[PDB]
């Protein structure tokens with residue numbers, strides 16, 4: 001249900017659509033490696049496959065941008081990091097002295 | 109009520125036509 | 128355990144719905160008698 | 175702005191806790207009492223947590239409720255740890271939401 005508006009607007013206005021944004025938070029909480037997690041009822045796999053099939057499927061979308069934040073990049077599934085799904089990966093680290101000076105400048 | 113009114117009107121029109 | 132159970136769901140209809148012959152659609156019997164009376168009177172009028 | 179002048183620490187029912195309450199008052203309710211204009215000028219947010227720990231039965235719930243009372247505020251919403259959990263997927267975290 002998070003993609004419905006984007007599809008609806010793309011089908012009408014092809015390449016004049018506005019940009020749609022959806023933010024996933026704590027991505028590593030539910031999107032773990034499929035097949036490795038402990039046994040259960042089989043809901044994790046369904047979730048991962050659904051997201052995989054919706055992000056890049058047989059029907060194309062050119063309006064969506066999705067952002068993800070996490071602290072343990074190792075736990076994320078391997079197929080979600082393929083180019084075309086989560087293409088650009090960036091690392092934020094502790095600041096150095098000039099960074100601390102700039103943060104001080106912009107806080108006070 | 110509408111059908112009964114219609115029936116009454118038809119019976120009356122039969123009457124006018126009988127005259 | 129924890130979060131180791133799913134569940135389905137079933138559904139009951141309405142009591143007000145009850146039967147299928149509940150007038151306004153089933154009383155088309157009585158109404159049909161009214162309509163037949165209408166038809167007979169119109170037949171006479173057209174004649 | 176939401177407090178009265180006639181109270182220091184013991185005018186309410188808590189005795190023996192003096193330094194801790196001064197610290198709590200200074201750090202927690204030193205930005206909810208001043209006129210809003212000044213705090214807005216200073217450009218600072220409000221504290222959003224408080225963890226007070228100690229041996230059981232020493233007056234923690236009492237101080238919590240008294241803090242709640244002295245600053246107006248609605249009725250506290252109480253909960254205890256092991257009651258949150260359930261045995262259906264997505265119900266153990268719905269309660270925390």
Ligand SMILES: Nc1ncnc2c1ncn2[C@@H]1O[C@H](COP(=O)(O)OP(=O)(O)O)[C@@H](O)[C@H]1O
Pocket residue numbers: 187188189190191229230231232233234235236237
């Ligand atoms: N400093 C105090 N002054 C007055 N009463 C106290 C104090 N500390 C504890 N009490 C008494 O202990 C009870 C408060 O429960 P509390 O000790 O806070 O439970 P817990 O510490 O297990 O959360 C009340 O009956 C209260 O009168």
